[PDB]
């Protein structure tokens, strides 16, 4: 059992809303993996001074090769020195089209499946809304321009419109009645049954959550889910550079630039696999076009304003449209919110005047205003919404430079032992 120093530095960059891999390391069953990443994160030069900080999220997952390669892997390992070589997957014939999984597309335009499948699995088990279509892309070449290079899009920071109730949420439960009578005992079960359905719809869409519900547990191997080993996050701040020449004097450019550590406590790697670490930069969804729900309603009813408890706990959800939340709110986008939820949270305010001011990372256009009457598309972060405020994405929206200190104890003959025959 000896130390293998896999420390290495990395220079990266990506688009706002998209999730990018920043460092992946292959591990072996028996490995004791430790990772201390430290460095600084920045964003392409801004147009004006600094407005608000971006929330940066770093993740480190562990994925058994078995999760990727399936039973085909168990054999690979079982057959040992005979095993049918594991198949690789395909990327498009472009260098960058492998980015989402932290690597340049190799000479042969094909990268190892575990990189690709892991990225998916990670995305489907933690980043997409449980109700959104599960990402299934077979190969890195079924991926489109933006995705393959920048990573999949993730959800905006949770707020009233970005974190609604799953669209298929029941708004009424019908129960069969005879013609002149009703089974009150049936009506009973009816409700109970509804309950089980809601419990699920609301927060138990994933198998594990259902089991946990009974007060049980589930190995990560049960539903084949990446293992979240470590998750840190922080706010990216910086400074303004002052203009000093005849015409620039009195102008300011914001240079976001935050240092940070992302430490992963010693971890025991039970089976051969990959340790993937990804980042995700986002800006809180501030919009000069959003207003308090109550300022929007035209006919203010008791059931709205009053905030009568008796009601708030027994009414069904409420279907409202983005129109109800933004002046330019797309009306075709319907979201189901919880009653009087506008009394459980206050929205951020931006004087309209910032509306057309190039340079602030605000949503100067009602969310999903150019994706169509599609909710999911509105909820996921459209990185173009930001092209506006950057002086020049020569390094995309953001970028970072960090040193990844990695120490791994493992059964490994010494290089000498490898090169020496006798």
């Amino acid at each position: 059992r000896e130390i293998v120093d896999l420390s290495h530095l990395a220079f990266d960059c990506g688009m706002l809303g998209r999730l990018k891999t920043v460092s992946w390391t292959p591990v072996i069953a028996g490995d004791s993996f430790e990772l201390d990443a430290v460095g600084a994160l920045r964003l392409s030069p801004l147009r004006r001074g600094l407005a608000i900080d971006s929330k940066v999220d770093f993740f480190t997952f562990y994925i058994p090769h078995r999760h990727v390669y399936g039973d085909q892997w168990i054999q690979f390992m079982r057959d040992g020195v005979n095993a049918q070589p594991l198949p690789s997957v395909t990327c498009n014939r472009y260098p960058d089209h492998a980015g989402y999984v932290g690597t340049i597309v190799p000479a042969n335009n094909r990268i190892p499946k575990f990189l690709h499948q892991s990225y998916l699995n990670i995305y489907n088990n933690y980043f997409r809304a449980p109700w959104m279509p599960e990402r299934t892309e077979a190969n890195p070449s079924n991926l489109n321009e933006d995705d393959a290079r920048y990573g999949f899009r993730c959800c905006h920071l949770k707020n009233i419109w970005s974190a609604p109730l799953p669209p298929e949420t029941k708004l009424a439960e019908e129960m069969g009645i005879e013609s002149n009578s009703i089974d009150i005992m049936g009506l009973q079960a009816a409700y109970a049954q509804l309950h089980t359905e809601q419990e699920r719809t609301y927060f138990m869409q994933r198998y594990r959550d259902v089991i946990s519900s009974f007060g049980g547990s589930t190995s990560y191997d049960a539903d084949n889910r990446p293992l979240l080993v470590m998750h840190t996050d922080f706010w990216a701040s910086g400074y303004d550079v002052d203009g000093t020449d005849q015409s620039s004097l009195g102008q300011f450019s914001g240079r976001v630039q935050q240092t940070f550590k992302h430490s992963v406590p010693r971890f025991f790697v039970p089976e051969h696999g990959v340790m993937m670490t990804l980042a995700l930069i986002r800006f809180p969804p501030i919009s000069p076009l959003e207003h308090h729900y109550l300022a929007g309603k035209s006919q203010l009813t008791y059931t709205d304003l009053a905030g009568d408890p008796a009601l708030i706990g027994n009414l069904p959800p409420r279907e409202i449209s983005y129109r109800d939340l933004f002046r330019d709110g797309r009306s075709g986008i319907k979201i189901k919110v919880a009653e009087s939820i506008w009394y459980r949270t206050h929205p951020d305010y931006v004087n309209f005047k910032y509306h057309d001011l190039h340079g602030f990372p605000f949503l100067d256009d009602a969310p999903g205003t150019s994706t169509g009457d599609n909710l999911q598309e509105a909820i996921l972060v459209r990185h173009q919404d930001y092209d506006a405020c950057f002086q020049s994405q020569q390094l995309l929206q953001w970028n970072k430079q960090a040193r990844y200190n990695v120490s791994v104890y493992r059964h490994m003959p010494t290089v000498r032992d490898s090169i020496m025959t006798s």
């Binding site: 600084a40 935050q258 940070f260 430079q401 040193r403």
Partner: peptide
């Protein structure tokens, strides 16, 4: 979140030997 003002990265530098090349090479 770490306070400090951004520092440039240094060396990619441990266990036993890795590079056998015939003798000493700087």
């Amino acid at each position: 979140a770490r306070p400090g003002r951004p520092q440039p990265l240094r060396g990619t530098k441990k266990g036993a030997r890795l590079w056998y090349v015939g003798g000493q090479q700087f």
